[PDB]
């Protein structure tokens, strides 16, 4: 088969780990069981080609700004992740993540992932966001972001409902293949 090194970046709120682990364990929605240890691995077929996909889950905190990019060399594809219910994460895609990733891996492909899709239509989430004069990120807002930073694809998804999920990795791999 064929190895694929996929690195996941984004803020903390975003909940990258839940996404990763619930995809790789093929867990029942909501029924994922966490570990204390990082990254994750999957042996999957895409368009009839077998691959071993390693998923490297990075720390989003700035204390890790100096350490995190040590992982970047020889990455096959990147997932840049923001929560659709956090306007600020969406911004740090433009301000922090894309610049970092592109500085280290200029030509390496990028998938742009909005997450917590399940919460965008959630009443309470929308109302708390409104209290601060905030809105969830709209599909076209995200698609725009993706065109902007030059992401090979833009996808939305929920790790909880698992809707949209399998596609993210299918698409990362398809982006390498």
């Amino acid at each position: 088969m064929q190895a694929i090194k996929c690195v996941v970046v984004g803020d903390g709120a975003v909940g990258k780990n839940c996404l990763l682990i619930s995809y790789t364990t093929n867990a029942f929605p909501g029924e994922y069981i966490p570990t204390v240890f990082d990254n994750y691995s999957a042996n999957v077929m895409v368009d009839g080609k077998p691959v071993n996909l390693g998923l490297w889950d990075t720390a989003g905190q700035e204390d890790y700004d100096r350490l995190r990019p040590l992982s970047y060399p020889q990455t096959d594809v990147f997932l840049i992740c923001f929560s659709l219910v956090s306007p600020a994460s969406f911004e740090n895609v433009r301000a922090k993540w894309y610049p970092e990733v592109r500085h280290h891996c200029p030509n390496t492909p990028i998938i742009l992932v909005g997450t917590k899709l399940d919460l965008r239509d959630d009443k309470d989430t929308i109302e708390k966001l409104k209290e601060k004069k905030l809105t969830p990120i709209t599909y076209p807002q995200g698609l725009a972001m993706a065109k902007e930073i030059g992401a090979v694809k833009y996808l939305e998804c929920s790790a909880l409902t698992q809707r949209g999920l399998k596609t993210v990795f299918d698409e990362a791999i398809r982006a390498v293949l």
Binding site: M1, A3, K5, K16, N17, N26, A27, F28, E31, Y32, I33, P34, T35, V36, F37, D38, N39, S41, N43, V44, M45, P50, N52, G54, W56, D57, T58, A59, Q61, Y64, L67, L70, S71, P73, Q74, K166
Partner: protein, 427 residues
């Protein structure tokens, strides 16, 4: 409608066995074989033909009209037919990558050629092909299959289905979403359940069709021939995912207070055990669940299992890499760095903050043993990671060198702390 056709076919098959009609029984062994080859299931095709050879003896007694299949119908010794079928089967199992079975049947044929009909050319070839099979088990990747549990609930189902659970052996690279998709097309009128919890009588007694499906974990069957022996991961790992009757499902359930910082302190596990009638793989891709039990796992216990699993992964990788030096490091880099520097999920530090407080111990006297066990596991993780890192150090590319140096630092530091607290171990 192939799942349905196969169901019917197997039903009438059983009927014929129970009713002692051999000709019909065999006609249906063959119906089923053709149904498997349709779907390209060579393994279960082989397993069905074995149902036929089970009737043949190694012997020169003429094959009865009725023990022969409808097409063939020419005079043959039991042995001749047996041999021919065995050749076919061994081939199916080859295509199924079932090489341990292929080798078994080979062994049979070879004892025949050697002890009975004295054909040393056939023997010689048999032996060469066994050699290839063992080689294959060693040097060729066999994708781990997934197992899915399916409950069929409501009075809408045929009695053979109704309110029962089955374990389905998935295809290569098949995941529950693909599997379930194709399953639910076979049951157009079926509702699709949103839980893994066993439903009450309100659901079981309803008139409709309610299907519940989730992935389960195969449990390594106890094998007499491996008991005290030093079997290689390469050999026994396969038995972990194949030729299995027992499956676990684990659902996390929270009980009591949830600590936002430590989610591991509050996480219980609900573990169901399923036991199938027959092992998989077998005559079909699915067998009924007969015994089923339930157990509840405490956060501490879970931590133990987790630690144990990580240690075991590191170990297996070390074996794997020592054994083949051509291997890409990325998987090693990822696994090791993930366990040594778990900046995201937190590492066993969370376990320490949870169970090693004097309060936890005053609250849970009975658990003391396990506590030491955990400490033990922790201590032991150090020499493991260390040996992985040595290997890593030899292989790592010049681009990942700095990465490696960093991993090295975190390890040395962690080694310092762990030895200081729980003591020393080595390999």
């Amino acid at each position: 409608s192939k799942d349905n056709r196969m169901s019917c076919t197997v039903n009438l098959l059983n009927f014929y066995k129970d009713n002692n009609r051999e000709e019909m029984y065999i006609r249906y062994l063959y119906k089923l074989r053709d149904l498997h080859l349709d779907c390209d299931n060579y393994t279960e095709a082989a397993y069905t033909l074995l149902l036929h050879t089970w009737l043949l003896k190694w012997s020169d007694e003429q094959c009865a009209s009725q023990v022969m299949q409808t097409g063939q119908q020419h005079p043959q010794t039991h042995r001749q037919l047996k041999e021919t079928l065995y050749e076919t089967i061994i081939g199916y199992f080859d295509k199924g990558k079932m090489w341990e079975e292929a080798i078994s049947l080979c062994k049979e044929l070879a004892e025949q050629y050697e002890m009975e009909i004295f054909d040393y050319e056939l023997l010689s070839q048999n032996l060469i092909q066994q050699a290839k099979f063992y080689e294959s088990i060693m040097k060729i990747l066999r994708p781990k299959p997934d197992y899915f549990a399916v409950g069929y609930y409501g009075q809408g189902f045929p009695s053979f289905l109704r309110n029962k659970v089955f374990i389905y052996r998935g295809k290569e690279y098949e995941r529950r979403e693909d599997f379930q998709m194709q399953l639910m097309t076979q049951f157009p009128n079926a509702e699709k359940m949103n839980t893994t919890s066993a439903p009450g009588d309100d659901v079981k007694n309803a008139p409709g069709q309610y299907i519940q499906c989730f992935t389960v974990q195969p449990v390594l069957d106890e094998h007499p021939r491996f008991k005290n022996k030093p079997v290689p991961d390469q050999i026994i790992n396969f038995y972990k995912s194949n030729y299995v009757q027992r499956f676990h499902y684990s659902r996390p359930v929270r009980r009591g207070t949830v600590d936002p910082e430590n989610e591991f302190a509050s996480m219980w596990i609900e573990r169901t055990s399923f036991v199938t009638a027959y092992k998989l793989p077998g005559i079909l891709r699915w067998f009924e669940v007969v015994h089923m039990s339930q157990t509840t796992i405490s956060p501490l216990e879970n931590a133990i299992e987790t630690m144990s699993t990580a240690n075991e992964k590191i170990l297996m990788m070390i074996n794997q890499y020592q054994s083949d030096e051509t291997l890409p490091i990325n998987p090693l880099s990822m696994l090791l760095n993930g366990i040594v520097d778990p900046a995201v999920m937190g590492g066993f530090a969370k376990y320490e903050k949870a169970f090693f407080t004097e309060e936890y111990v005053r609250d849970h006297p009975e658990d003391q043993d396990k506590l030491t066990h955990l400490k033990d596991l922790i201590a032991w993780q150090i020499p493991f990671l260390g040996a992985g890192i040595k290997i890593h150090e030899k292989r790592v590319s010049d681009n990942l060198r700095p990465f490696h140096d960093r991993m090295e630092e975190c390890f040395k530091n962690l080694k310092m702390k762990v030895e200081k607290e729980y003591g020393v171990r080595e390999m």
